[PDB]
Chains A and B, each alone.
Chain A
Amino acid sequence: NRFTVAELKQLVARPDVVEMHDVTAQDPKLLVHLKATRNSVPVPRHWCFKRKYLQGKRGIEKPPFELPDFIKRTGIQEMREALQEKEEQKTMKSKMREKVRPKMGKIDIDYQKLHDAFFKWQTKPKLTIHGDLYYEGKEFETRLKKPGDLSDELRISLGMPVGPNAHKVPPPWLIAMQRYGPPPSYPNLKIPGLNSPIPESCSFGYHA
């Protein structure tokens, strides 16, 4: 009755969306057609787990809150921290005496500054598409580079100052690239000093 994964992969036009659990369902062809659709969203990976997607980050350290620039540019966070530091030092008698005769004017910063930060200084957040789902390890997987370009961290680790002059700004592996030739995995890669002009292509690489 239930076919294997090989027949379900050979019968469907898109065998990349076929899984091992879809072969024992009530409709393998309908599931293969729905999973390989144009605008379909896949199922989350927490449907087959046993921690209910909330018991993984138990002992991991996390920041309390990430305030934006429009909220931190109003001076309310420092005043709230100062009020929390002043309120933590008061005893029970100082808290009971301030309830009958309170001291008005806690911070009293401004009235139009918050409206200017929420209306004129409004910044759009970093949104995402509807297909990019969320998981437990999505907040920690930030590793997801180009040939001919190097970052500042790799240049600081390797000790290669990036400059417009191509004398020392290419890495010292370019001598082997001049002795042996261009890399066979990238025929369109152009490096200055070998197949590109040195003062023109100051980016130490071009993919043309």
Chain B
Amino acid sequence: ERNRPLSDEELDAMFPEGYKVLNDQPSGNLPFLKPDDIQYFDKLLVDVDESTLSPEEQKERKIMKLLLKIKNGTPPMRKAALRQITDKAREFGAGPLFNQILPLLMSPTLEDQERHLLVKVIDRILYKLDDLVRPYVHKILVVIEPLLIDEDYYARVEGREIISNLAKAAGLATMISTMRPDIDNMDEYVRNTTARAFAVVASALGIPSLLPFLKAVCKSKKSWQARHTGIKIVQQIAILMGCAILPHLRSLVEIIEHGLVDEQQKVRTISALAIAALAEAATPYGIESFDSVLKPLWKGIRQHRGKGLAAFLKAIGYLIPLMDAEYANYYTREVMLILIREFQSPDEEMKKIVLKVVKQCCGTDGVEANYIKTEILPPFFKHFWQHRMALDRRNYRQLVDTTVELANKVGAAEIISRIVDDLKDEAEQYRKMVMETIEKIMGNLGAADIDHKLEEQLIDGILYAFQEQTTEDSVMLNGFGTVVNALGKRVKPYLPQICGTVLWRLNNKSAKVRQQAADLISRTAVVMKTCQEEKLMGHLGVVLYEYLGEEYPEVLGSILGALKAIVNVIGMHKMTPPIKDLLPRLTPILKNRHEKVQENCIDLVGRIADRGAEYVSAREWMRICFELLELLKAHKKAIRRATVNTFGYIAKAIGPHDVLATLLNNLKVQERQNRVCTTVAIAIVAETCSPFTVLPALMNEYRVPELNVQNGVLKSLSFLFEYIGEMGKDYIYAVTPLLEDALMDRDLVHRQTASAVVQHMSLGVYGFGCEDSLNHLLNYVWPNVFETSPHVIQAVMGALEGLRVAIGPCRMLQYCLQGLFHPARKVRDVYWKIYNSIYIGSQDALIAHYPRIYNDDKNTYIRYELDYIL
């Protein structure tokens, strides 16, 4: 739809004047239905005509009709349909809702967004349908089963959350009764999905809640498929819950020790995988509970060869750090020959298991460095350092971790002398993996073991890897920066050879090469000040001041970041691109619509306002403060946090008299993320400078007849009070009539802003003797607790939590008095919530503030201990 070609008339109709060229609709306003989805919405094309022929299930057709607004409708229409389905989930019932949601999600012509919307509708209708989806548990579990084994992590997390919500809503007996015929199924993928769902239900409902059922499923001797499914469920529960199965490790080990003894090799491999998952989950733990599991594992690893021997070797490598020093030394002396013999294995899974076990086999004492460098490192370099290992991510990350472990155990120089030959290869993935391994060796160990005969070769390999980059990955620049930080003063005959390559890469036909050169100059900017290189940095700054005319914005943002790094690494008033010829040069650069470039320009403007404010004639700052209001309303969450600091620095430099009027004039914009940012900038300007000078002006913005300007002024006052804290004791009497008049307004947003300002004044002036203004604010905020809005209720709860800590728990108990036994339940629930919040805030303070209760006929409630006096 978005990539369909259009004619000339459709292109001409979408352009205004003044430019020179160089039935099928169901019931009216429903969205367009797919031709393959005319089966679930087949009853919507005809008219309803409700006249003595409308059963209850036709109302379920309306539950389909809102589904027609939920699948491919408008996002406000989808939000309205989701609200109508969540507000009427109990009245419509879970039966027809499940009967309409089950064939919709099981369609073979679905999409990712429709499946995500169906999962969101199933999760949103799961809170109101509690204890009612027990017959519909299997119909939801059969649809949520392939979602956990999906490729996307977000869909798997949503499926796990839906399975946890179904296990919390259906209890423990229904989930065990529904998944009981789903263990002995003929399909292996359905059995694995049922085992994963049972492991998720055991993780969401507790380990002893499903421990005897899993023990009975594992101890039953009827078929190998049920035992394999139980072992897979135990392995998934051990891999999902890391440190949660640590008190229940013995009960899992006693069930896992019964396996790996039958004639079936698949059940033995599943038991070995479950033992390896239990060893890797609780580590270092389970030393005494795994004493009866190593004796069959060593026999299975020494008597046979294959996938089961590789699983036993992986289990031994996972349980070897979980033992003592002598036990690991005895296990490592008898497993190194089996690891060296399995280095030439043609299988990829056995090679991955050997690469995973080699990282844990040499991680402590017992293994000498000479034998590991003589008989372990040449076969690991000849059998694992290939081109096919860099293709898969799991085969490359584990190999890089094993190389980092071998460099940390034996030595970094012996690995750097053998890994530098692959840096100038013809493969990009192998060169990136070698650069990542070199960066990990430079970050973990360092470059002190590298001599002068290898550092120049490593620098040449890093330059060849950076100069022959085809992708947009930042691994090579980070590796070069880590190598430069590890070198330090040893890269002194290397700065002209890097500068001649950085300057030649800035003039090219491509756009990513100049951005990569600017990123490499920014990453190597801190290595020039510590190496007594000031003329090269002054030349690079003068080059970057003129190289700001790159038409690519990704190169211009990198050049601005390199200029900011050069200004941070050097002096602000001692730069050959000085601040007098750079701050007017960046004033048209701040009006860019980019994300990273505008954020870098805002950071440079903030640095020039904080460190070089005496380099301007007090005129460009007042013009840049008007452009700072246009730098907000961006979906990046980085420029809006720096623009307030830049406005505060400009107000501290040029005086808080010109920026405050602009911040008050820009508060009336009627746009999201534009009024809160100006209020935060005004609060930062009041916190950086004197808060009294912005005190009457903040009292002036409430005088204008406008709701948005008054709400922005109240938010600015609340943010200034929250930024001040203990300094708000002198500005409480000036804000007390404004907070008294703002709480009596008809608008709920102004009342919530006044409650937030009262909460900030209570949390800031707590313990200063200002309880009279806090009580006067609480006496007006107490009728505001009966609101129906959740935001106003949260603001009233925050104001109550501030007044309980400021005015004392006794005043909070007196304000909440005679409301716990109230006849109206809508006020009694709020009073009970306020009493629970006051008890959670201060439980010991409610003893002395408790009221006197008379004794009853059968029970006594009079405190005779505190009533007596000596």
A164 to B788, CA, bound (A): 60
CB distance from B48 to the nearest CB of A (A): 34
Contact partner, A118, options B692, B702, B819, Cβ 8 Å: B692
| Known A47-B786, A76-B697, A83-B661; contact A40-B817, beta-carbon cutoff 8 A | yes
Q: Is the CB of B814 within 8 A of A47?
A: no
Stretch from A107-115, A148-156, A196-204 at the B interface: A107-115
| Known A44-B783, A47-B786; contact A54-B748, beta-carbon cutoff 8 A | yes
Q: Is the CB of B814 within 8 A of A41?
A: yes
Q: Is the CB of A71 within 8 A of B699?
A: yes
Q: Is the CB of B788 within 8 A of A76?
A: no
In the complex, B412 has a CB within 8 A of chain A: no
A58: chain B residues at CB < 8 Å are: 746
In the complex, B187 has a CB within 8 A of chain A: no
Q: Is the CB of A124 within 8 A of B733?
A: yes
Q: Is the CB of B700 within 8 A of A130?
A: no
Q: Is the CB of A84 within 8 A of B657?
A: no
In the complex, B744 has a CB within 8 A of chain A: yes
Q: Is the CB of A71 within 8 A of B696?
A: yes
In the complex, A194 has a CB within 8 A of chain B: no
CB distance from A64 to the nearest CB of B (A): 5
A155 to B734, CA, bound (A): 37
A52 to B731, CA, bound (A): 32
A52 to B741, CA, bound (A): 18
Q: Is the CB of A40 within 8 A of B623?
A: no
For chain B residues 671-712, which have a beta carbon within 8 Å of chain A?
690, 692-693, 695-697, 699-700, 702-705
In the complex, A158 has a CB within 8 A of chain B: no
A129 to B744, CA, bound (A): 17
CB distance from B141 to the nearest CB of A (A): 42
B730: chain A residues at CB < 8 Å are: 118-119, 122
For chain A residues 6-53, which have a beta carbon within 8 Å of chain B?
21-22, 24-27, 30-31, 33-35, 37-44, 46-48, 52-53
Residue of A nearest to B619 (CB): A104
A39: chain B residues at CB < 8 Å are: 814, 817, 851
A77 to B89, CA, bound (A): 55
- Among B693, B776, B827, chain A packs the most CB atoms within 10 A around the CB of B693
In the complex, B823 has a CB within 8 A of chain A: yes
In the complex, B853 has a CB within 8 A of chain A: yes
Main secondary structure of the interface of A (DSSP, over half): loop
Residue of A nearest to B697 (CB): A76
Chain A 115-134 near chain B by CB (<8 Å), digits 1 or 0: 10111001111011110111
A130: chain B residues at CB < 8 Å are: 775, 778-779, 811, 814-815
B778: chain A residues at CB < 8 Å are: 130
CB distance from A109 to the nearest CB of B (A): 9
Q: Is the CB of B851 within 8 A of A37?
A: yes
Residue of B nearest to A135 (CB): B783
Contact partner, B741, options A66, A107, A111, A128, Cβ 8 Å: A66
- Among A27, A52, A107, A130, chain B packs the most CB atoms within 10 A around the CB of A130
A102: chain B residues at CB < 8 Å are: 622-623, 626, 658
A40 to B831, CA, bound (A): 13
Residue of A nearest to B788 (CB): A52
For chain B residues 765-785, which have a beta carbon within 8 Å of chain A?
772-773, 775-776, 778-780, 782-783
| Known A43-B819, A58-B746, A133-B779; contact A125-B736, beta-carbon cutoff 8 A | yes
Q: Is the CB of A74 within 8 A of B786?
A: no
Q: Is the CB of A41 within 8 A of B822?
A: no
A76 to B660, CA, bound (A): 13
Q: Is the CB of A65 within 8 A of B623?
A: no
Q: How many A-B residue pairs have CB under 8 A?
A: 174
In the complex, B74 has a CB within 8 A of chain A: no
| Known A66-B741, A77-B696, A118-B730; contact A40-B851, beta-carbon cutoff 8 A | yes
Q: Is the CB of A65 within 8 A of B786?
A: no
| Known A26-B821, A55-B746; contact A66-B665, beta-carbon cutoff 8 A | no
Residue of A nearest to B662 (CB): A102
Contact partner, A128, options B618, B627, B776, B820, Cβ 8 Å: B776
Q: Is the CB of B822 within 8 A of A43?
A: yes
A115 to B740, CA, bound (A): 23
Q: Is the CB of A65 within 8 A of B741?
A: yes
Contact partner, A67, options B699, B775, B819, B822, Cβ 8 Å: B699
Q: Is the CB of A64 within 8 A of B703?
A: yes
Q: Is the CB of B823 within 8 A of A24?
A: yes
CB distance from B520 to the nearest CB of A (A): 37
In the complex, A167 has a CB within 8 A of chain B: no
In the complex, B826 has a CB within 8 A of chain A: yes
Q: Is the CB of B775 within 8 A of A129?
A: yes
A31 to B821, CA, bound (A): 5
| Known A53-B786, A104-B619; contact A125-B779, beta-carbon cutoff 8 A | no
B853: chain A residues at CB < 8 Å are: 33
Residue of A nearest to B626 (CB): A99
Contact partner, B734, options A47, A70, A87, A129, Cβ 8 Å: A70
A122 to B734, CA, bound (A): 8
Residue of A nearest to B817 (CB): A40
Q: Is the CB of A41 within 8 A of B824?
A: no
Q: Is the CB of B822 within 8 A of A52?
A: no
A55 to B787, CA, bound (A): 13
In the complex, A57 has a CB within 8 A of chain B: yes
Q: Is the CB of A31 within 8 A of B818?
A: yes
Q: Is the CB of A123 within 8 A of B733?
A: yes
A123 to B736, CA, bound (A): 11
Q: Is the CB of A30 within 8 A of B821?
A: yes
B816: chain A residues at CB < 8 Å are: 41
In the complex, B854 has a CB within 8 A of chain A: yes
B779: chain A residues at CB < 8 Å are: 128-130, 132-134
Q: Is the CB of B818 within 8 A of A47?
A: no
A84 to B783, CA, bound (A): 36
Q: Is the CB of A99 within 8 A of B623?
A: yes
A-B CB contact pairs (8 Å), 5 listed: A24-B823, A33-B853, A41-B816, A71-B699, A77-B700
The 5 closest A-B pairs by CB, nearest first: A25-B823, A40-B817, A34-B818, A76-B696, A65-B703
By a beta-carbon cutoff of 8 Å, the part of chain A in contact with chain B is 21-22, 24-27, 30-31, 33-35, 37-44, 46-48, 52-55, 57-58, 64-68, 70-71, 74, 76-77, 80, 83-84, 87, 99-102, 104-108, 111, 114-115, 117-119, 122-125, 127-130, 132-135, 139
| Given A43-B827, A130-B811, 5 additional A-B pairs, CB 8 A | A46-B783, A53-B786, A54-B746, A119-B730, A125-B737
